């Protein structure tokens, strides 16, 4: 359950979380990557979670995660907060698409993983 996921910054790789630093988070966002803006207290993120996990097993581009929860670190938070601003994020979940480090699309709300995979193919 998303409720038992440790909050922080991570990369979701073939369905597995690898926790990262704010530095690596920023680094990954200069290239091709999908940023997932998530929250553990969000019922929509709970619905979407299984779908997002599956998507990570169908695409090659890194899915970078921000997962909000109470014990998130100050710097982890600011790093994510910056990108959430620049992308114009207004709720969760939201996927933000980075190409060569530029924000070029968003997918808002819970969706089946098929729809996430289509958007990735369209863009990468």
TrEMBL record:
This is Thioredoxin. The chain holds residues 225 to 347 of 349 of the full protein. It comes from Aeropyrum pernix (strain ATCC 700893 / DSM 11879 / JCM 9820 / NBRC 100138 / K1). It comes from the Archaea. Residues 19-112 form the Thioredoxin domain.
């Amino acid at each position: 359950s998303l409720s038992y996921v440790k909050e922080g910054l991570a990369v979701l790789e073939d369905g597995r979380l690898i926790y990262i630093t704010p530095e690596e988070f920023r680094q990954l966002l200069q290239g091709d990557a999908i940023l997932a803006v998530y929250s553990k207290t969000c019922p929509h993120c709970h619905r979407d979670w299984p779908q997002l996990i599956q998507a990570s097993k169908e695409v090659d581009v890194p899915i970078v995660m921000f997962i909000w929860g109470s014990l998130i670190g100050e710097r982890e938070l600011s790093a994510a907060r910056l990108e959430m601003n620049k992308a114009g994020v207004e709720g969760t979940p939201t996927l933000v698409f980075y190409k060569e480090g530029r924000i070029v699309d968003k997918l808002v709300g819970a969706t089946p993983w098929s729809l996430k995979v289509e958007k990735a193919r369209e863009i990468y």
